[PDB]
């Protein structure tokens, strides 16, 4: 394993003897991770990376039905819980009962607002985060019924209701503004085919203002480059077919710098710590950046791998981010939840599967049963559900008015 | 991680 090797130990943190609050914390994670790495040596077994797929399935399968009061804090993020669970199962190649999928469809219909979009639960004001989630859920199911839950004529009204003169959108009426709104609107509007000519007017320009001196993208122009916002920005530009509104060179140097030499997983910001959900937000940026670069006819691009260590990210996840009882997590010690479950898995799948036209170099770490279904690097739903949804809505006219 |  790239990680359990002896030279990899030189990838340990160089403190410079000038220790700050950052060195300290980083060095702490590194030790807890080292332990996991050396887990094998101390115990005298041969290393066998395996994805506790059954344990994970039973966790997800239960949460799709009911959660403890520990989830009272995500009571305004219910379409998210459907998405995270229904996508983890989707990647684990697990089943979505013709009855459960309906209930999900029926529940989301209750979340949907008469003004368009979706709320965090029955009766909540529509918000772009839950709308993005509800739409991705409905597409993962992908049936006349699910698709039919989405009110496209109302969704455009709503999208237009949030649209800002400078190109940005609010997340909800009277709500905040940051790149998530741009990606959320772009993802749902494109999939459901409601993109008019002036919908995203000036949106690519605002998103390009979020790109700062680091090569990365921040929440709003002027802010620190962050991995979850950089994915929202890049993916939003890929949808709008405007990746080129950014300096892709520096964006590439920035994203690639985010992978932890010693841990293998990614960090959300320069000098922060690794975190499993970033296995998708950050690593997902390379496939996006492959297309982008090859699109401008780049020669130096690989025909088998992404521009990050696919091996190291799969070791990090398999070894360090898996919960014995099921579910994945931030890093060792951290508790499990459906968000990290949905994102460590999405990142594993990004890491295991490459593409480049007709090239297909999958890399599956450990037990080959560890390979996951594929996921689309823009929507983060199976590439088939994406294709299936867009075309179905494509036979509907954009809500012209 | 709070995303909303």
């Amino acid at each position: 394993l790239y990680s359990l090797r002896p030279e990899h130990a030189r990838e340990r943190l160089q403190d410079d003897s000038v220790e700050t609050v950052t060195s300290i914390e980083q060095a702490k994670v590194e030790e807890k991770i080292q332990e996991v790495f050396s887990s094998y040596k101390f115990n005298h077994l041969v290393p066998r990376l395996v994805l506790q797929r059954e344990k994970h399935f039973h966790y997800l399968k239960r949460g799709l039905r009911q959660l403890t009061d520990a989830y009272e804090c995500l009571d305004a993020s219910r379409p998210w819980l459907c998405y995270w669970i229904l996508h983890s199962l989707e990647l684990l190649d697990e089943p979505i009962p013709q009855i459960v999928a309906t209930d999900v469809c029926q529940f989301l219909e209750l979340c949907q607002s008469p003004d368009g979009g979706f709320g965090g639960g029955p009766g909540q004001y529509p918000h772009l985060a839950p709308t993005y989630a509800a739409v991705n859920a409905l597409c993962i199911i992908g049936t006349e019924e699910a698709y039919n839950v989405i009110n496209r004529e109302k969704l455009l009204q709503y999208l237009y209701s949030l649209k800002q003169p400078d190109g940005s959108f609010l997340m909800h009426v009277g709500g905040e503004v940051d790149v998530r709104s741009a990606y959320c609107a772009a993802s749902v509007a494109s999939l459901t085919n409601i993109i008019t000519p002036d919908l995203f007017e000036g949106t690519a320009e605002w998103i390009a203002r979020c790109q700062n001196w680091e090569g990365g993208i921040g929440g709003v122009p002027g802010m620190e480059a962050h991995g979850g916002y950089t994915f929202c920005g890049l993916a939003a530009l890929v949808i709008l077919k405007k990746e080129r509104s950014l300096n892709l060179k520096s964006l590439l140097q920035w994203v690639t710098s985010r992978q932890m030499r010693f841990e293998g997983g990614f960090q959300g910001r320069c000098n922060k710590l690794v975190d499993g959900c970033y296995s998708f937000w950050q690593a997902g940026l390379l496939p996006l950046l492959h297309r982008a670069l090859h699109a401008q006819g780049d020669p130096a691009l690989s025909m088998s791998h992404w521009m990050f260590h696919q091996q190291a990210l799969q070791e990090y996840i398999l070894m360090c981010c898996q919960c014995p009882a099921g579910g994945l997590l931030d890093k060792p010690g951290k508790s499990r939840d459906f968000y990290h479950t949905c994102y460590c898995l999405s990142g594993l799948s990004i890491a295991q599967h490459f593409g480049s036209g007709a090239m297909l170099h999958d890399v599956v770490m450990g037990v080959p049963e560890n390979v996951l279904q594929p996921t689309h690097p823009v929507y983060n739903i199976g590439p088939d559900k994406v294709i299936q949804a867009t075309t179905h809505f494509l036979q509907k006219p954009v809500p012209g008015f | 991680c709070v995303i909303m």
Binding site: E11, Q14, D15, D16, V18, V21, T22, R65, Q66, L67, T68, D69, E72, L74, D75, A76, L81, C82, V100, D103, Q106, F107, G119, G120, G121, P122, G123, Q124, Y125, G174, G175, E176, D178, N212, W213, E214, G218, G219, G222, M223, E224, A225, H226, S257, M260, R261, G264, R269, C270, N271, K272, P299, A300, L301, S302, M307, F308, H309, A312 | M4
Partner: protein, 312 residues
């Protein structure tokens, strides 16, 4: 009026001033999914919220209730919205509300609604007088709270409060020179006040940054900052650069020195230079060292820079 934590807290259903209203329960549908088993207390406040809201009862009791609804789930943006409506309608003392949101943010500094609610009040009041001091207190508990820095940039930008922020950035950079939020803030500030076009400023910056590098050579932020402030004019328009950095090869080396050199070389090539053939050889060797020995986590990127360095 009555704490959710008080030993003598009573359910809204058991309340005398809340009997004329019927608690509207959540409708998750005959066959629930991702259904949360709320506590009797969580369900109680919310059944009453659904009703007051549903009635659009813009009352003082409704006001006091959102407070409890917010404490049970501060991330409930719908309740936060109805509360702003009550703020306007009931014509509430906003400064008193500034104090409320101040305490709530201290509690959940990573909540999106609380920061936005605060921003709405400051706008209503057109008063940014408490901001930099409040933020600095939050950044004192977590020097990298994204919401705190973002809110900070808004107060400075909008109210044009730039004068003492670089002094603040310097303070925090003294506390943790690896604080990327501060390196970014320093750029935000300089680039919005004087800019980096001023030779004296540019020099002062590169000097200071070359210092932080020749002090904590493996601190990436200082490297991405120095690169950031120069790369926007051409690293190759700075002859002395390659030298001073080359001087740090054995005294302050990290794969950052090598990566920066690979970046200068790239620009001495874009701009064409004598010895370019050797330059390209030196640069590709560095790409192989970083790719094979010096920084293999990104061997895919480093060899790709080797291959692009071929074509262009």
């Amino acid at each position: 009026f009555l704490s959710l934590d008080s030993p003598t807290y009573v359910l809204y259903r058991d309340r005398a001033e809340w009997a004329d209203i019927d608690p509207v329960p959540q409708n998750d549908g005959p066959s629930p999914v991702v259904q949360i088993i709320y506590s009797e207390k969580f369900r109680d406040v919310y059944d009453y919220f659904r009703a007051v809201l549903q009635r659009d009862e813009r009352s003082e009791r409704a006001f006091k209730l959102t407070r409890d609804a917010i404490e049970l789930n501060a991330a409930n943006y719908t309740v936060w919205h109805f509360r702003r409506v009550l703020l306007r309608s009931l014509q509430k003392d906003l400064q008193e509300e500034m104090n409320y949101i101040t305490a709530i943010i201290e509690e959940q500094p990573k909540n999106y609604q609380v920061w936005h609610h605060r921003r709405v009040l400051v706008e209503w009041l057109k008063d940014p007088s408490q901001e930099l001091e409040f933020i600095a207190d939050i950044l004192n508990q977590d020097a990298k709270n994204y919401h705190a820095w973002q809110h900070r940039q808004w107060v400075i930008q909008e109210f044009r409060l730039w004068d003492n922020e670089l002094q603040y950035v310097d303070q925090l950079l003294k506390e943790d020179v690896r604080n990327n939020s501060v390196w970014n803030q320093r750029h935000f500030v300089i680039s919005n006040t004087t800019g980096y076009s001023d030779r004296a400023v540019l020099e002062r910056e590169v000097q200071y940054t070359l210092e932080m590098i020749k002090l904590v050579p493996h601190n990436e932020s200082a490297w991405n900052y120095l690169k950031g402030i120069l790369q926007d004019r051409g690293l190759s328009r700075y002859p002395n650069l390659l030298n001073q950095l080359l001087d740090l090869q054995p005294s302050h080396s990290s794969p950052y020195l090598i990566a920066f050199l690979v970046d200068i070389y790239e620009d001495m090539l874009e701009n064409q230079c004598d010895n370019k053939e050797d330059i390209l050889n030196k640069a590709l060797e560095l790409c192989e060292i970083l790719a094979k020995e010096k920084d293999t986590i990104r061997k895919e990127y480093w060899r790709y820079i080797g291959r692009s360095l071929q074509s262009k």
